[PDB]
Design a protein around this ligand. Structure first.
Ligand SMILES: Cc1cc(Oc2cccc(O)c2)cc(-c2ccccc2)n1
Lengths: 93, 104, 100
């Protein structure tokens, strides 16, 4: 279980932790053993543009739409980013 | 696609953005892959090492032949814009379900 | 050859470089070290188990892996003052590279 949010959107730590906690909760869909991270990369681009954007890699779920949807709400609401600027990737020690 | 530049070389944001723009152009030109459809990123890791040494260095992951023309063209840009030695630039071509958030 | 340590544990640079040098030695002991990258990526908001307490993810790409894993887990436990229960080690065997 691993979720990483990669984004040029800067949030305060209290708010990052809230968002990550909400995603872990999401990731009901399929625990105590799980990584999540919020990686701030100001210079991150998509579509030739450096304005607000979120890449999310989720590893290890097959269900997947319910997760993606739920996550896309969380990020759109907590990060005040346009949903057309969110990409969600699944990969399926 | 995704291009990520991973480097202990610190550049100002105006310069980072230029450099990334030049690479996207490169990928786009040399590979004929769709423009706008690419992530690029510049990840600053001051403690990044290669060869036992923390001197200036660039790792470039390209994710998802012509390939040398790209690698070459990128290696100029980084050497020129980052003022780094070309002997300290490694270019890695690297290889599931995907979604946009507008579908929701 | 690439080792990346991903952790919310903040260390001073002198100490980070030390730790990375010790790992390269490990990876080397268990080819030689001129053909390798290592990095220590500080992500303060990194969580595991629903908790932001000290933790280490290590990706090691392109290399008896147990000898490596064990030896690195000692280094990180010692140098980062972190609980071994909070350290996970991944190997990847994921394709070419091209300056000098
Ligand atoms: C169709 C496609 C495009 C792709 O390039 C990207 C990756 C991230 C964002 C993006 O806009 C394109 C990567 C992938 C991909 C991602 C992970 C593993 C294998 C392929 N697949």
């Amino acid at each position: 279980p691993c979720c990483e949010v990669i984004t040029n959107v800067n949030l305060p730590d209290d708010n990052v932790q809230s968002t990550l906690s909400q995603i872990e909760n999401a990731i009901d869909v399929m625990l105590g053993y799980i990584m999540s991270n919020y990686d701030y990369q100001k210079n991150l681009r998509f579509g030739g543009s450096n304005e607000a954007y979120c890449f999310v890699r989720i590893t290890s779920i097959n269900n997947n739409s319910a997760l993606a949807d739920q996550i896309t709400k969380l990020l759109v609401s907590n990060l005040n980013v346009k949903s057309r600027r969110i990409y969600v990737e699944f990969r399926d020690a």
